[PDB]
Amino acid sequence: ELPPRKVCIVGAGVSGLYIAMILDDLKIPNLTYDIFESSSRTGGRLYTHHFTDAKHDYYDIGAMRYPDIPSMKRTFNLFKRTGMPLIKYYLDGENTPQLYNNHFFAKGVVDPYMVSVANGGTVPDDVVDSVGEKLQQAFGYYKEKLAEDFDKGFDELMLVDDMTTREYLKRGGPKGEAPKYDFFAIQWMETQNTGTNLFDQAFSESVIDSFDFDNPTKPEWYCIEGGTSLLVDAMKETLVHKVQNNKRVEAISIDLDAPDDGNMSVKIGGKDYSGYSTVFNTTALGCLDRMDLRGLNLHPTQADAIRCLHYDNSTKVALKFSYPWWIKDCGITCGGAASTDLPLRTCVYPSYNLGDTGEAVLLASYTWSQDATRIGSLVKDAPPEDELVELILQNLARLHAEHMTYEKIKEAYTGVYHAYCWANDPNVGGAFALFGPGQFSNLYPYLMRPAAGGKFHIVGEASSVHHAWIIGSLESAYTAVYQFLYKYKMWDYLRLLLERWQYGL
């Protein structure tokens, strides 16, 4: 029979819970695991906030929406396996306002926002109304290759990964044969495509974001009615060994002088937990970098990747109202989102409360990058005149000025809100990977390099080509389990892993 072995799973977000789900399904004789989670809470960046127990009285602080595209089949298979109650998510809705330079969008108007050179701004006239077309020309070849086969498309995209999005647009691609855009044209494309400054990160991440948000297959989107944390609950209930919360790992080691399979250990609260045949670290990389990893003798460039791979920021702000005034008064009847240059940047109309006529949640601000740092500076652990509330109410009034007043929005506000800035969470230290130029092609391979003689895995969304999505976490977890089984030559169970899990079970 197989000898007794135990493995350590650091972190109980979705990738750690997925590792355990796979091990529980394979039922390998005499194999066990410990899962140590630093937080009192399990689920990580799957985190629904419930204002009350009322059915729809929540918002998702982390993951909230899922496009049904082939490259995310593993995510949807996880949803099926756990019985998630999926409902439609409306990425684009009806009647959602867009507000830039204090003007509302209107279709078939030239330069509705009055930012073109012709109207006294600095955006070139040939770009102001054609951002979508110009970015589809910049990204579209790669998007089509990614749709044919994500991993082959990605490898081809890596041949231009040295460039930022701005660099690609400025120089006309890698040999100057694509259109060349001036600073203000690029600035307007960024303003109309993503968060402030993100075109100074990798071109490849801008391509992949466009692939996921504007996929050639024109996919249906889904959300989990009741919040994404229903998935955490479901994954927890099947665990053979339950999560050990309030266990923050501070060091990971291997004793290369010991002949045993179980020669790895972790330190928690100054105490050694030993006897592990493999350690799967699933934390964000900032949390990993803080650990003492000398005991693992990591390649220096792998250590560089842990420190240096770039993370984006993100902040959410959700308010409760006494009735869904955006539905009733503004005609915003089926979700979507309102985009603006105002501080709140993006106001997301929930897809899960469309038929409610009483209290309703609005995801009034969802921001990335410097926009998220700025809103996040107003988000306090012990919330307080609350400057953030007043900013959001004032921005909401300006964004919905076609139908509402500040006074009526403020009156409808119940005084209950919640906000969260992920860069201020000590258990993540960022929202999610969003790599800088050259990082995917140069640092990422070293992040993914075998370590501790094939017994240590750096797992999670950053350790994948699908940053900022559940699919990246699940892929990364699947691959690590493959490597573990291969390392110990558990061929029956590796064949079973492929049979049952190569697309998600």
- Interface residues with ligand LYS (CB under 6 A)? 65, 209, 312, 434, 468-469
Whether 365 and 418 have beta carbons less than 8 Å apart is answered as no
As measured in angstroms, the least distance from the Cβ of 250 to ligand FAD is 7
Q: Which CB sits closer to ligand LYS, 113 or 440?
A: 440
Binding to ligand FAD, residues 303-362 (CB under 6 A): 314
In the stretch 81-120, what mask flags binding to a copy of itself with x, by CB under 8 A?
A: --------------------xx----------xxx----x
As measured in angstroms, the least distance from the Cβ of 212 to ligand FAD is 9
As measured in angstroms, the least distance from the Cβ of 471 to ligand FAD is 6
As measured in angstroms, the least distance from the Cβ of 433 to ligand FAD is 8
Rounded CA separation 227/166 (Å): 36
**Backbone dihedral angles phi then psi of residue 375, each to the nearest 5 degrees:** -65, -40
Does 249 carry a binding-site annotation? yes
Q: Which CB sits closer to a copy of itself, 385 or 499?
A: 385
Counting contacts by CB under 8 A, is residue 408 touching a copy of itself?
no
Q: How many residues lie near a copy of itself (CB under 8 A)? A: 70
Does 461 carry a binding-site annotation? yes
- Token readout for 293 is 């990893």
Q: What is the rounded end-to-end Cα distance, in angstroms, of the chain? A: 26
Widest Cα–Cα separation across the chain: 78
Counting contacts by CB under 6 A, is residue 429 touching ligand FAD?
no
State the amino acid at position 51 in one-letter form.
Answer: F
Q: Which CB sits closer to ligand FAD, 223 or 330?
A: 223
* Closest to 370 (Cα-Cα) out of 350, 341, 400: 341
Whether 168 and 186 have beta carbons less than 8 Å apart is answered as no
Counting contacts by CB under 6 A, is residue 473 touching ligand FAD?
yes
Counting contacts by CB under 8 A, is residue 308 touching a copy of itself?
yes
Residue 204 contacts which entry, ligand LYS, ligand FAD, a copy of itself, none (Cβ below 5-8 A, type-dependent): none
Does 404 carry a binding-site annotation? no
Does 64 carry a binding-site annotation? yes
Q: Which CB sits closer to ligand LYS, 291 or 447?
A: 447
Does 248 carry a binding-site annotation? no
Residue 434 contacts which entry, ligand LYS, a copy of itself, ligand FAD, none (Cβ below 5-8 A, type-dependent): ligand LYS
As measured in angstroms, the least distance from the Cβ of 25 to ligand LYS is 27
Pick the binder of ligand FAD from 7, 8, 11, 146 (CB under 6 A).
11
Whether 194 and 210 have beta carbons less than 8 Å apart is answered as no
Counting contacts by CB under 6 A, is residue 480 touching ligand FAD?
no
* Closest to 280 (Cα-Cα) out of 269, 270, 288, 290: 288
Instruction: Find tokens 């493999």 and name the residue.
Output: 278
Counting contacts by CB under 8 A, is residue 25 touching a copy of itself?
no
Distance of CA 330 to the CA centre of its chain: 30
Counting contacts by CB under 8 A, is residue 149 touching a copy of itself?
no
Counting contacts by CB under 6 A, is residue 195 touching ligand FAD?
no
464-500: buried (b, 16+ CB within 10 Å) or exposed (e) per residue? bbbbbbbbbbbbbbbebbbbbbebbebeebbebbeee
As beta bridge partners, residue 224 has 86
Rounded CA separation 229/215 (Å): 26
DSSP letter string, 3-60 = PPEEEEEE--BHHHHHHHHHHHHHT-TTEEEEEE-SSSSSBTT--EEESSSSTT-EEE
Rounded CA separation 367/339 (Å): 10
For the four alpha carbons of 69, 71, 73 and 75, in that order, the dihedral sign comes to negative
Does 411 carry a binding-site annotation? no
* Closest to 387 (Cα-Cα) out of 400, 397, 374: 374
- DSSP code at position 164: B
| Residue numbering of the annotated binding site for FAD | 15, 37, 45, 64-65, 249, 461, 469-470, 473
Contact positions toward a copy of itself, by CB under 8 A?
A: 101-102, 113-115, 120-122, 162, 164, 166-167, 170, 183-184, 187, 191, 196-197, 200-201, 248, 250, 269, 286, 289-290, 292, 294, 299-301, 303-304, 307-308, 310-311, 313, 341, 343, 370, 373-374, 376-378, 380-382, 385, 387, 390-391, 394, 398, 423-426, 428-430, 436-438, 441-443, 446
Contact positions toward ligand FAD, by CB under 6 A?
A: 10-16, 36-39, 44-46, 62-66, 248-249, 282-284, 287, 314, 422, 427-428, 431-432, 460-461, 468-470, 472-473
